[PDB]
Write a protein that binds this ligand. Structure first.
Ligand SMILES: CC(=O)N[C@@H]1[C@@H](O[C@@H]2O[C@H](CO)[C@H](O)[C@H](O)[C@H]2O)[C@@H](O)[C@@H](CO)O[C@H]1O
Ligand SMILES: CC(=O)N[C@@H]1[C@@H](O[C@@H]2O[C@H](CO)[C@H](O)[C@H](O)[C@H]2O)[C@@H](O)[C@@H](CO)O[C@H]1O
Lengths: 359, 365
């Protein structure tokens, strides 16, 4: 009964009216037995919408571990025939979850499950390796995709696939990720060797050697928008390898490795290491994210308005109230959303992108 | 007499050749020559080869507006004007009143050959680093604003600027700006606060610090540091011309030093201003992140593979600002900026020469 168009306009009425039977992996394993029906019923798009999009193939590395129904909506939201989608399922997900992903992945020849799966531990190298596994497959399996966008189960796009290609063009062969001067408060992350003690990455207290790099370490996000040339480079380059193994025992390497690579002289699509080229999460186009401690009055020093949903680890899990402002940002994808916190943020967004993409 | 292609590819031997080409010595037009040449428009246009026919349907549907500020060197003005001329666009030229009558006449001369090119209805006597430099652009904005309502963005240029993107490339980046303004705007550095803390007066033709402390800015939002160059939407221009508060802000800045390097940067961070950015520093644009103007400063140049924003200047340095030599061209063309600064015919015509044909050759596709 909810009127989406109104939520998309900030209308306080709907926002308030907004602010149960749920599918399960088994329900998916069953819906996918017949691909043609799943696709038709779930209204997936299997026919390029424009030649412009067919001429600009994108690759995606989606790291997941549960919430099968979110993965379904996410994929459909960003699905196109010319693209390439490598799904990474955590080696620890529910066997039925895994089988459910395979069922969805096996209905499209451009969708598949990474040939190597890692058991992902929070803030550890494995998180990066998850994405690396996906890069290895996508890089070798095709040489025509322009950029690689890595996602996660709780991301959702706020742009159609057309708008994404156009912005990727505006990038003119350059990458686009958050990459800034190392905050002193995040240095402890890589100045000490870490290890998994009790399923938790802990500080061993051993001081690490300096990074085998002439370039300084930069700070960023785990999400990115890099060119195929970048991927091949971190995959092949003899030095990127020295750095990567050095980062293996650091805390949250995913939030400093990509951003540091982006500023290494020889890297395709990179930026000079002069802080004149630094990119903050708001300047970059990778992902729009609201951190608890920055929300406030945008008319007084705040990057963005306060969160209408809830917060998990200081990260705003969007609610129907956030949509209006969010949609006016330049980012490709927003994080995070949760069917268990507000399925309406996702529904309204979902339909909007589909309609806007069909007009 | 020299292979441009090589120069754009950064060939050391070739760059070295222009050096020998210069010292080892020509046609030099003057304001009068132009007053004569403009007598017959058909000929001037045809001869100087001005693209008087819209190139694509994509450009015709996306009108651009330019505000060019000049005071001398009429041959430079004509070259820059041809490099960016397009029938669908609009060009407002501001000639300094301290300029030679022959020069102003030359510009009035050229301007008459084009219905879309005109001299600003109000000319200022510009003083370096003074509020009058901001007033000149403001004078153009009003003329361009009232003259037409279909141009999307206004780009302000000075005499020594040259484009490094074709008009279509420019139109495309503007479409990508998706309605936002693009210009430098960063946290106000400490060493530049003195520019607006004290009052400034022109003494013997040079703006000097009176010592008289001034009232705080008429703003709830902070003061931002930037440059005199920008890219803004027809709405940004409209708002600054009609908005009350801004008036109080501008007049308050009339007695400041280089009001042009904090004024625009600041208005771009004001809530309600069309195409602005949150005051939060997460949205700060450095000169390299913005796309308005590529410019190298002597104290920043050096080993790019070691922290330097860009490599050493190949031309010369006027006031710490690099005047481009053929040698700078290669690296510069790979930057995302719309225009560069600065170029000097007397320092290296080859840099302007190659850059000139390359852009034309590329527009023609
Ligand atoms: C204060 C602090 O260290 N917070 C950490 C988070 O930092 C944010 O990182 C994002 C990157 O997209 C962005 O730079 C933001 O401005 C930062 O505040 C973040 O690193 C988090 C782990 O995901 O850990 C917090 O401790
Ligand atoms: C060191 C210093 O104060 N230099 C002044 C110039 O500063 C530069 O300003 C540009 C603006 O585009 C850019 O931000 C660069 O990083 C700065 O170094 C500049 O303000 C100039 C006046 O035009 O005066 C110099 O003294």
């Amino acid at each position: 009964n909810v009127n989406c168009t109104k939520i998309l306009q900030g209308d306080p009425e709907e926002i308030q009216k907004v602010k149960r039977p749920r599918w399960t992996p088994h329900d998916y394993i069953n819906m996918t037995r017949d691909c043609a029906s799943f696709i038709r019923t779930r209204k997936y798009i299997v026919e390029p919408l424009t030649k412009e999009e067919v001429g600009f193939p994108i690759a995606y590395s989606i790291v997941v571990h549960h919430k099968i129904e979110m993965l379904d909506r996410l994929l459909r939201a960003i699905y196109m025939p010319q693209n390439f989608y490598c799904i990474h399922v955590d080696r620890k997900a529910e066997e039925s979850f895994l089988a459910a992903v395979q069922g969805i992945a096996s209905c499209f020849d451009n969708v598949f499950v990474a040939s190597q799966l890692e058991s992902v531990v929070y803030a550890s190298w494995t998180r990066v390796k998850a994405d690396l596994n996906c890069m290895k497959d996508l890089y070798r399996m095709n040489a025509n995709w322009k950029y690689l966008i890595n996602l996660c189960g709780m991301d959702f796009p706020i742009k159609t696939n057309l708008e994404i290609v156009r912005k990727l063009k505006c990038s003119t062969g350059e990458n686009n990720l958050e990459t800034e001067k190392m905050p002193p408060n995040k240095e402890e992350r890589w100045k000490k060797r870490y290890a998994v003690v009790d399923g938790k990455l802990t500080n061993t207290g051993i001081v690490k050697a300096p990074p085998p790099l002439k370039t300084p370490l930069f700070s960023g996000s785990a999400y990115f928008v890099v060119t195929r040339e970048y991927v091949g480079y971190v995959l092949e380059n003899e030095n990127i390898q020295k750095l990567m193994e050095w980062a293996q025992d650091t805390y949250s390497p995913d939030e400093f490795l990509w951003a540091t690579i982006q500023r290494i002289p020889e890297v395709p699509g990179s930026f000079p290491s002069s802080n004149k080229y630094d990119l903050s999460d708001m300047n970059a186009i990778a992902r729009f994210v609201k951190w608890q401690y920055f929300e406030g009055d945008v008319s007084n020093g705040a990057p963005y308005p306060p969160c209408s949903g809830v917060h998990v680890r200081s990260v705003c899990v969007f609610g129907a109230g956030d949509l209006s402002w969010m949609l006016r940002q330049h980012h490709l994808f927003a994080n995070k959303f949760d069917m268990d916190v507000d399925p309406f943020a996702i529904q309204c967004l979902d339909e909007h992108l589909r309609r806007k993409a069909l007009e």
